[PDB]
Write a protein that binds this DNA or RNA. Structure first.
Length: 153
DNA sequence: AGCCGCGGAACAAACTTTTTGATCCGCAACCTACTGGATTGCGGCTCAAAAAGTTTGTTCCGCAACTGTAAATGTAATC
């Protein structure tokens, strides 16, 4: 249900398909409060609209498990601590490779386990319009970027 | 996600500084007067030889910031 409605709005999907839209990413760096520089790659002002639309399309047939207050609608940071108020101890994990190592190979099989079917052309569309190429070269390695509007879901 | 020059390193032949195992030669001893044989013996001193201790020329190992079309965004706070 992605390729069917892709050309309905802004019928320019014929172009920008072969012109490496994943490359359309600006890289800057924000200073942390302490040691560290955070690289952020965000799409051009045009790609974010397409990514938001495809997020809305994807949300039609998905389910997100509870106890994961990670960017779900109407759930601020307070409910994260509301569950944890009655405890006495805590063990805080912190995952490494912040969103920059989630390859597209690990999303299609995740959806397959999720029991949702996706077309091969739709799979190519997902791989091409919702990821970032750091090497900026053809047939490169695709990694999710911290900053894309499609990163949370 | 790829891998620049830089500098230690893991090895490995050459120098190089002593550990050892004889050989010697005064050197006081016998013996008796004194070179006594036709003698031993005994302790410093020196000898290369070789098992130990550096020293130096070569070969891989590792690692950083960002990449070719590309966002200035009123306030606070999250990954």
């Amino acid at each position: 249900d992605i390729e069917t409605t892709l050309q309905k709005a802004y019928p320019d999907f014929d172009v920008l398909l072969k012109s490496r839209p994943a490359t359309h990413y600006k890289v800057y760096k924000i200073p942390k409060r302490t040691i560290g520089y955070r690289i952020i790659a965000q799409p051009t002002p045009r790609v974010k609209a397409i990514q938001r639309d495809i997020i809305e399309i994807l949300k039609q047939h998905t389910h997100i498990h509870d106890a994961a207050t990670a960017y779900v609608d109407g759930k601020n940071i307070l409910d994260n601590a509301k569950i944890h108020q009655s405890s006495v101890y805590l063990l805080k994990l912190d995952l490494v490779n912040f969103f920059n190592k989630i390859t597209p190979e690990l999303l299609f099989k995740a959806l397959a386990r999720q029991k949702v079917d996706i077309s091969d052309t739709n799979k190519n569309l997902l791989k091409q319009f919702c990821f970032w190429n750091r090497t900026k070269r053809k047939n490169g390695a695709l990694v999710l970027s911290v900053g894309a509007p499609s990163s949370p879901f």
